[PDB]
Coordinates of C-alpha atoms and ligand atoms in Angstrom, one line a residue:
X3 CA -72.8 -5.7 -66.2
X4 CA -69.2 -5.4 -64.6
X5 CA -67.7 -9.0 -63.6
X6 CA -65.5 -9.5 -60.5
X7 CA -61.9 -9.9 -61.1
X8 CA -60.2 -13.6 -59.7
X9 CA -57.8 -12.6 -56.9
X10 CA -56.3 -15.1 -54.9
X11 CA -54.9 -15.1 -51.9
X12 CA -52.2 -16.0 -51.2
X13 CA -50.4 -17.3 -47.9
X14 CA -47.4 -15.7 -47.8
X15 CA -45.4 -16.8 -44.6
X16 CA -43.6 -20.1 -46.4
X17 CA -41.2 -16.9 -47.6
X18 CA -40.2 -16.2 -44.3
X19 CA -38.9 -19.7 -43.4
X20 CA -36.7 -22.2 -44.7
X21 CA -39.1 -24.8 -46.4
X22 CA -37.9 -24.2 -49.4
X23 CA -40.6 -26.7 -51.5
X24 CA -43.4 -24.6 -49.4
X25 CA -41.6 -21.6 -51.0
X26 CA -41.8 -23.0 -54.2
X27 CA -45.4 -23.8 -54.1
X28 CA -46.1 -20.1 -53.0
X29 CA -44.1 -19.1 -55.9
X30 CA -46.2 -21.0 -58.5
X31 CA -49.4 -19.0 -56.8
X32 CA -47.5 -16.3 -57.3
X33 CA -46.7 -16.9 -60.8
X34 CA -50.3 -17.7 -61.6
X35 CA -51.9 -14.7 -60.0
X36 CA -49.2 -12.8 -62.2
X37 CA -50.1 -14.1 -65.9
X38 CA -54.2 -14.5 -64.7
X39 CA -54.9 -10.7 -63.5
X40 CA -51.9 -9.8 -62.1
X41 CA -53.1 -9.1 -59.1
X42 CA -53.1 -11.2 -55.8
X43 CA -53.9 -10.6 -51.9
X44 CA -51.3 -11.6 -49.7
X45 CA -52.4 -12.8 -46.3
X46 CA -50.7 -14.2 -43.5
X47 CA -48.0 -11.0 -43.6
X48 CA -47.3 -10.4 -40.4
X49 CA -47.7 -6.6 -40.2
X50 CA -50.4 -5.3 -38.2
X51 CA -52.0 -3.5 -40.3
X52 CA -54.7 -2.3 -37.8
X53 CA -52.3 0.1 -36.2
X54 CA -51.4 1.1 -39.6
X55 CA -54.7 2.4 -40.4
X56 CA -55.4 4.1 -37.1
X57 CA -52.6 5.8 -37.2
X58 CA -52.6 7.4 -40.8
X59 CA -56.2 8.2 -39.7
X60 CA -54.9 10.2 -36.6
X61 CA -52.4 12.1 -38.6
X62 CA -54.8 12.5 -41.9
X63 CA -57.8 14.0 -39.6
X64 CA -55.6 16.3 -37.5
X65 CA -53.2 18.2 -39.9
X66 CA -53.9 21.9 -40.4
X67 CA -53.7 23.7 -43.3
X68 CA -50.9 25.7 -42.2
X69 CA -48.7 22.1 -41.7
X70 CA -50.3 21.1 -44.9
X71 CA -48.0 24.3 -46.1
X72 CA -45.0 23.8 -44.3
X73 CA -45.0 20.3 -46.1
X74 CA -46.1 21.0 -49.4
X75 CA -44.2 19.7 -52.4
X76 CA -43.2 22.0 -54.9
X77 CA -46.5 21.5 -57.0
X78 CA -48.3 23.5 -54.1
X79 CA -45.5 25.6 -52.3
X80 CA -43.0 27.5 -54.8
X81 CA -40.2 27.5 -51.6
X82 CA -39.8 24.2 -51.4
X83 CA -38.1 23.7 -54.7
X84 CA -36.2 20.3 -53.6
X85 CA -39.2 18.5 -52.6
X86 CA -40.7 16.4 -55.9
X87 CA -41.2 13.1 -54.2
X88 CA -41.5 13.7 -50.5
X89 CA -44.2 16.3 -48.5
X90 CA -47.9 16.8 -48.5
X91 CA -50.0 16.4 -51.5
X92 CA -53.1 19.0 -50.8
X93 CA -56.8 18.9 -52.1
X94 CA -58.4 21.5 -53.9
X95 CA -61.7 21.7 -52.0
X96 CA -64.8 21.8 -54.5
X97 CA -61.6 21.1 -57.2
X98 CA -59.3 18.1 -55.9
X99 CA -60.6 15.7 -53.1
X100 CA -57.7 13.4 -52.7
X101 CA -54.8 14.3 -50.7
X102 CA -51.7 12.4 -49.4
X103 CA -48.7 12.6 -47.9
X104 CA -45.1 10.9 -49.6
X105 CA -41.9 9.9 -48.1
X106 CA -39.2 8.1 -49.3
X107 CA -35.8 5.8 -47.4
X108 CA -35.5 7.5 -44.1
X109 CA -32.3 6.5 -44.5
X110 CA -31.3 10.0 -47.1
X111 CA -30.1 12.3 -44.6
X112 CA -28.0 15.4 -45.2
X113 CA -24.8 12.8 -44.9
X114 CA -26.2 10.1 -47.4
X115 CA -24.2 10.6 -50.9
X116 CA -26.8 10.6 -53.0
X117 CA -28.2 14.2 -51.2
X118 CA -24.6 15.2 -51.1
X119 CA -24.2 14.7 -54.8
X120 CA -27.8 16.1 -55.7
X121 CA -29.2 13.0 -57.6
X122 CA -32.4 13.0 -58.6
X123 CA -35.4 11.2 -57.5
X124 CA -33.3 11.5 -53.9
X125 CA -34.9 13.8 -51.5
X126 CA -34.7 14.0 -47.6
X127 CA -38.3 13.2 -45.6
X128 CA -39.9 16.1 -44.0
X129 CA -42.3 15.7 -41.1
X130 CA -44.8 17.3 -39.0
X131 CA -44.1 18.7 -35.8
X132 CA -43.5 16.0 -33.3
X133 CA -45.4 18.0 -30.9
X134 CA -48.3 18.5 -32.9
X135 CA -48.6 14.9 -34.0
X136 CA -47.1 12.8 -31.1
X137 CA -45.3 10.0 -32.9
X138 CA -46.4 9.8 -36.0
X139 CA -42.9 9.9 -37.4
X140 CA -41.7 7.3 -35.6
X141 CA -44.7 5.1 -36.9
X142 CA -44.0 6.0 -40.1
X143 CA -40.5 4.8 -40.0
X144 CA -40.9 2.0 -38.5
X145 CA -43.8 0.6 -40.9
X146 CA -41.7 1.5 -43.8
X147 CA -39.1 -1.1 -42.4
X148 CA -42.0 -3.4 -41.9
X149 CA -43.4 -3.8 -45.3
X150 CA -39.7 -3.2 -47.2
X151 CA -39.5 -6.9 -45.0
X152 CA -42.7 -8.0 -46.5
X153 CA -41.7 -6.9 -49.9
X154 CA -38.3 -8.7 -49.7
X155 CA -39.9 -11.9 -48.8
X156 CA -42.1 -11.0 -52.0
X157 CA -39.3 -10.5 -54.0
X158 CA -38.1 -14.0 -53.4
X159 CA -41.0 -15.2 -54.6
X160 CA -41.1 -14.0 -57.6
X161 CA -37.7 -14.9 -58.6
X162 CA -38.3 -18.4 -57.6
X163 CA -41.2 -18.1 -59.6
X164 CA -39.4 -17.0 -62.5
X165 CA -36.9 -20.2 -62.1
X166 CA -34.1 -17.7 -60.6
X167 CA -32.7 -17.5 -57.4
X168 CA -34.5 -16.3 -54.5
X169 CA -32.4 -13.3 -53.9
X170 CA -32.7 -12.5 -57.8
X171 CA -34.7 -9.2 -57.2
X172 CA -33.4 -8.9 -53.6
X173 CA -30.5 -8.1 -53.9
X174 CA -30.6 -4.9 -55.7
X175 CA -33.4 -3.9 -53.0
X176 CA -31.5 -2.5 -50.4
X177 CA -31.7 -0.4 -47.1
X178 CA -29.2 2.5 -47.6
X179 CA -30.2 3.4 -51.6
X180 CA -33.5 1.9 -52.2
X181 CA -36.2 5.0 -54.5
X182 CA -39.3 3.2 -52.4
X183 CA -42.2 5.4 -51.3
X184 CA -44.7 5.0 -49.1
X185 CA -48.2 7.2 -49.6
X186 CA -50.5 8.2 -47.1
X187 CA -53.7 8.7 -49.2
X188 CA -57.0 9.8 -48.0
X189 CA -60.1 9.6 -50.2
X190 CA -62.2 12.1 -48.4
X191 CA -66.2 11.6 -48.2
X192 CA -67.9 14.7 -49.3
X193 CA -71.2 16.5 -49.6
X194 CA -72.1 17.5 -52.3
X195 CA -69.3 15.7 -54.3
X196 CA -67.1 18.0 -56.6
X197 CA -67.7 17.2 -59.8
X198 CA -64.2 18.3 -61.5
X199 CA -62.6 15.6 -59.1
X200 CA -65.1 12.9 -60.9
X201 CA -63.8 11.8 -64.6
X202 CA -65.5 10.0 -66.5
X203 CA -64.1 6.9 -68.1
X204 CA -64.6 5.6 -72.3
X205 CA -67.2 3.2 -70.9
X206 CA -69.6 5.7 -69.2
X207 CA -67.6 4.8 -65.6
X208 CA -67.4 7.7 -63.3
X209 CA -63.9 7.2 -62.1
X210 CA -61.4 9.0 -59.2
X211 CA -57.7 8.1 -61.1
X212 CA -57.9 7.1 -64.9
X213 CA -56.2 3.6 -66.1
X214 CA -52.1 3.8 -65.9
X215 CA -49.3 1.4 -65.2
X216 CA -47.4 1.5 -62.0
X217 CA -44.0 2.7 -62.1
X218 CA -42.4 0.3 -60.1
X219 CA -41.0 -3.2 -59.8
X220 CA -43.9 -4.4 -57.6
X221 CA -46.5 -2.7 -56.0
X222 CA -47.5 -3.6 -52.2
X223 CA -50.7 -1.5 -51.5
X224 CA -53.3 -1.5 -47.9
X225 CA -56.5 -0.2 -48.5
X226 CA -59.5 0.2 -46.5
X227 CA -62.3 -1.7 -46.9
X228 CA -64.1 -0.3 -49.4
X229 CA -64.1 -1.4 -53.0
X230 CA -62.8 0.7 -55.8
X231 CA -60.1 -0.4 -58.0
X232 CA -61.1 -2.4 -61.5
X233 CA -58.2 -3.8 -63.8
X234 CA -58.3 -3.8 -67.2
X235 CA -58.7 -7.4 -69.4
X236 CA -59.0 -8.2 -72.8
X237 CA -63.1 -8.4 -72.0
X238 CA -62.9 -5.1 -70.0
X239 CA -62.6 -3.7 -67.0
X240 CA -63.6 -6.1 -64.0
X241 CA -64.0 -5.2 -60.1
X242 CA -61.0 -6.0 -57.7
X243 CA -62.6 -6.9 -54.4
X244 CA -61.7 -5.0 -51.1
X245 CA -60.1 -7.3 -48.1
X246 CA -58.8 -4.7 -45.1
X247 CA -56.4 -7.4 -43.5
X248 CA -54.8 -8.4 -46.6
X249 CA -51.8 -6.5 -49.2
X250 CA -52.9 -6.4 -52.5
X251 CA -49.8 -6.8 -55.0
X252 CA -49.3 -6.3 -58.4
X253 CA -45.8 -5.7 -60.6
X254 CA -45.2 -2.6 -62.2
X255 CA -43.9 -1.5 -65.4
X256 CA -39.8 -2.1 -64.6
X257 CA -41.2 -5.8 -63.9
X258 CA -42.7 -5.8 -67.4
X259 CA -39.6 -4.7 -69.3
X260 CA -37.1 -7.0 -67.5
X261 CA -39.4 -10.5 -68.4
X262 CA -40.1 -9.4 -71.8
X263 CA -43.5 -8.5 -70.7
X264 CA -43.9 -12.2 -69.9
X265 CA -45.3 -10.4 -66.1
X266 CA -47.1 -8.2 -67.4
X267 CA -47.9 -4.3 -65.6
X268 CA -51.8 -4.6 -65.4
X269 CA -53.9 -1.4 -66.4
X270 CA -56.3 -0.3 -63.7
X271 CA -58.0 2.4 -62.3
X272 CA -59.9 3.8 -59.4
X273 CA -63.3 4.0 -59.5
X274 CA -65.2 6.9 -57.6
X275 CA -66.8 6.0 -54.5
X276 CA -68.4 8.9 -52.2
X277 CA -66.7 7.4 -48.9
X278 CA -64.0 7.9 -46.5
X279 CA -61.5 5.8 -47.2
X280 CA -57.9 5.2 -47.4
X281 CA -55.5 3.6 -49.7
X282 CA -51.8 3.0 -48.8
X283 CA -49.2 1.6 -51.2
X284 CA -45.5 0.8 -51.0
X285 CA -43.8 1.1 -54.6
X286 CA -41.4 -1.4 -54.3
X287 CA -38.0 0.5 -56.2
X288 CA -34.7 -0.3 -56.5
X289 CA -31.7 1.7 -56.1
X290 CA -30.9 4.9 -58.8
X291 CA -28.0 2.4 -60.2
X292 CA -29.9 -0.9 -59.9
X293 CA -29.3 -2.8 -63.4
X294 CA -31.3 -6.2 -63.7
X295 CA -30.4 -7.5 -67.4
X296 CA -33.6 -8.6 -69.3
X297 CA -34.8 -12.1 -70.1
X298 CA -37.4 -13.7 -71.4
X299 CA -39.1 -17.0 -69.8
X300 CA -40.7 -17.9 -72.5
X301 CA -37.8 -19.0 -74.5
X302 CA -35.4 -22.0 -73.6
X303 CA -32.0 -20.3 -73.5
X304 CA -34.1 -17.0 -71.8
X305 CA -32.9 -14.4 -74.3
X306 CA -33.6 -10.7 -74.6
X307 CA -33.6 -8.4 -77.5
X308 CA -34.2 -5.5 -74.5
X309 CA -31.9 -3.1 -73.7
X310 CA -30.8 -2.9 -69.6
X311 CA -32.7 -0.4 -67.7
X312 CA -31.2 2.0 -65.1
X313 CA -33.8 1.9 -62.8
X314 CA -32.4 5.4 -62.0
X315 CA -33.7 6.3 -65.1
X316 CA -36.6 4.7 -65.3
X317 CA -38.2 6.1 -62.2
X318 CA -37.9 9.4 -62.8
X319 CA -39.0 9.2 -66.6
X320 CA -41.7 7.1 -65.0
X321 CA -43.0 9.5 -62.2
X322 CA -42.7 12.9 -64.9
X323 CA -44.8 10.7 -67.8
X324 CA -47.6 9.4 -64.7
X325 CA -48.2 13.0 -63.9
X326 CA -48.4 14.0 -67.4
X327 CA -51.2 11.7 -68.3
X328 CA -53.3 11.3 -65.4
X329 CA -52.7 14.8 -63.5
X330 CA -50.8 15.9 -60.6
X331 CA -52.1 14.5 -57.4
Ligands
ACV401 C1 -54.0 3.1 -57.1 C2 -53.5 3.5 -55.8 C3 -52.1 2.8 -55.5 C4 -53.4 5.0 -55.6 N1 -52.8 5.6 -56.7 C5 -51.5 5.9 -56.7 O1 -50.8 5.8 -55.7 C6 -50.8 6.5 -58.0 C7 -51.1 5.5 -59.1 S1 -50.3 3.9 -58.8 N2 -49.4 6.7 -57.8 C8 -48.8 7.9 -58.0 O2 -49.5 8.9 -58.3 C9 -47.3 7.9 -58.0 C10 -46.8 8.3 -56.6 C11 -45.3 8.2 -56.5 C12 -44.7 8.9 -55.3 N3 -45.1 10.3 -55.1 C13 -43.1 8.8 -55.3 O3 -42.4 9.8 -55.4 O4 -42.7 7.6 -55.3 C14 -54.8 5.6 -55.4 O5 -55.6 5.1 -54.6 O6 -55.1 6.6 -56.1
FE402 FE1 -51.5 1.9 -59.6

């Protein structure tokens, strides 16, 4: 017997206006979602995610393998040596099912600094043809813009939730240097199923991606409407329930570290489920030099015996250690 997890949702417009005690109650939903679970659905968004999901279909149903090559990162395509983060993802057929497709700030060109001076974790988008897939890119763009918006609105939530100033988080989430990512991932539907894409969980689960924390501050993920992710609690593993209009968030591990683990990262996984389906998150990231000095809510005077965290750093020890233990994807 698996028990449903208790995700609210959560109306999240109040953030985009200037009520600022309808803020505050959105930030004590907030806060309870993120010491319950640690996940919530946030509705009322504003971001039509309709569009969103017809178009990643378009592009996901009409790349070739050759594109699929041209954009390969460097796990699939030995030429394309720079590309870690950003390019196509490829299944294995009868091996790998899942494939994606990663891209970063479209705001790293060849003249940002960070390319110039060859940091890592910085890479510069590629795309398909534009010929081949007829706006795609400037969808893709454009929705990054949209939900980095929605995520900045989050942001203030959670530091008013946290008894800091709105722009607490904010303010070190920024256009021109922020690591975010968005991934285009289809779940394919298959006949017969490969079994070496199936793993199979302590507790007899057949699962698609084993239990990790995200590396991230907060995670801001669409899916399709089709249920499949569990989170870990102290009684076990209990089922998230799909909602296709809604953004499902959840803090990652940076969130963890700078509030003493008073927010903590949840643990959860990805069931398997023989359907096509898509899943869509925005790692919310800072910039490489983003420092946000730990504290600790629990404690009157808010003091932390944690070290500062380059976020820098931490994303790219983060990203290398997530393919370690749960494979490359
Ligand atoms: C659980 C979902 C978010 C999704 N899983 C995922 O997206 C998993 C686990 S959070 N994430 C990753 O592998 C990290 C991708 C990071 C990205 N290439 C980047 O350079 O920033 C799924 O459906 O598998
Ligand atoms: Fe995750």
């Amino acid at each position: 017997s698996v028990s449903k997890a208790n995700v609210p949702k959560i109306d999240v417009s109040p953030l985009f206006g200037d009520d600022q005690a309808a803020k505050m109650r959105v930030a004590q939903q907030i806060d309870a979602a993120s010491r319950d679970t640690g996940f919530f659905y946030a509705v009322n968004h504003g971001i039509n995610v309709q569009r969103l999901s017809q178009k990643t279909k378009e592009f996901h149903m009409s790349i070739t393998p050759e594109e699929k090559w041209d954009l390969a990162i460097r796990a699939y395509n030995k030429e394309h040596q720079d590309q870690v983060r950003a390019g196509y993802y490829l299944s294995i057929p009868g091996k790998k099912a899942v494939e994606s497709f990663c891209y970063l700030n479209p705001n790293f060109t060849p003249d940002h600094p960070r390319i110039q001076a060859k940091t890592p974790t910085h890479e510069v988008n590629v795309w398909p043809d534009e010929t081949k897939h007829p706006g795609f890119q400037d969808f893709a763009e454009q929705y990054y813009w949209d939900v980095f918006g929605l995520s900045s609105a989050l942001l203030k939530g959670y530091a008013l939730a946290l008894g800091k100033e709105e722009n607490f988080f904010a303010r070190h989430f920024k256009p021109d240097d922020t690591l975010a990512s968005v991934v285009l991932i289809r779940y394919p539907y298959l006949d017969p199923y490969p079994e070496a894409a199936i793993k199979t969980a302590a507790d007899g689960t057949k699962l698609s991606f084993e239990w990790h924390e995200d590396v991230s501050l907060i995670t801001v993920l669409y899916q399709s409407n089709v249920q499949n992710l569990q989170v870990e609690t102290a009684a076990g593993y209990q089922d998230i329930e799909a909602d296709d209009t809604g953004y499902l968030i959840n803090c990652g591990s940076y969130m963890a570290h700078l509030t003493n683990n008073y927010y903590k990262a949840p643990i959860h996984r990805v069931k398997w489920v023989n359907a096509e389906r898509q899943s869509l998150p925005f790692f919310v990231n800072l910039g490489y030099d983003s420092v946000i000095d730990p504290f600790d809510p629990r404690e009157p005077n808010g003091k932390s015996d944690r070290e500062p965290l380059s976020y820098g750093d931490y994303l790219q020890n983060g990203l290398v250690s997530l393919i370690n233990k749960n494979g490359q994807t």
